[PDB]
Amino acid sequence: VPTFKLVLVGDGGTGKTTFVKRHLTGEFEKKYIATIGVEVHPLSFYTNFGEIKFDVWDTAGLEKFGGLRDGYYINAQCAIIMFDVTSRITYKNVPNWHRDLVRVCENIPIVLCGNKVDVKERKVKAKTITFHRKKNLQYYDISAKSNYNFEKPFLWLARKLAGNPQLEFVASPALAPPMEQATALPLPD
């Protein structure tokens, strides 16, 4: 069962860690706690080509928490670049993240993700988002908050890695299984 290293880069505040957390626990993290260097999390699912395992390397986007920076990209077999359609500067910075990444990893599949599309006042409009075209990156509008397209970066990446667009998610195996104070607590959503 192979494991693929996925690097996740982009400006701070753009929803990188929120996006990983969504996939890991199902939760939606409201606070911004800036990542410091990198955080690594295993992450898997099943497909008709078997189990697919990513080692997600969730890097810091704030320059002062940069850590080993491009030293995090060594041996990545794929990547996601993340910006915030609510914030122009984060899309303006997408070529820098892409530049540093490809200098380290020459020939890997890379997804551009424009996140937070659930926010009414969008600032980076669809017609501005062109960068991926000349660079052969896949692009998705996503939302970690509403789950819009949040599985798509993973499906596309797994299809590239397996070299087979026939790849699809299948059901993970369900194997054999092994108050009053709560009812009036508020609900996150």
Ligand X SMILES: Nc1nc2c(ncn2[C@@H]2O[C@H](COP(=O)(O)OP(=O)(O)OP(=O)(O)O)[C@@H](O)[C@H]2O)c(=O)[nH]1
Site for another protein in 70-89 (CB under 8 A): 70-71, 74-75, 87-89
Residue 128 lies near another protein (rule: CB under 8 A): no
Binding-residue pattern over the window 7 to 46 for another protein, x denoting contact by CB under 8 A = ------x---------x-xxxx--xx----xxxx----xx
Q: Identify which range of 57-65, 99-107, 152-160, 177-185 contacts ligand X by CB under 6 A.
A: 57-65
Cα distances (angstroms) measured from residue 22 to each of 19, 32, 88, 92: 5, 14, 24, 26
Asked if 91 and 114 touch (Cβ cutoff 8 Å), the reply is yes
Residue in 5, 22, 35, 94 binding Mg ion, rule: CB under 5 A: 35
Asked if 129 and 91 touch (Cβ cutoff 8 Å), the reply is yes
Reduce the DSSP state of residue 126 to 3 states and report it. helix
Residue 143 lies near ligand X (rule: CB under 6 A): yes
Binding-residue pattern over the window 42 to 81 for Mg ion, x denoting contact by CB under 5 A = ----------------------------------------
CA 162 to chain centre: 19
Instruction: Give the gyration radius of the chain's Cα atoms.
Output: 17
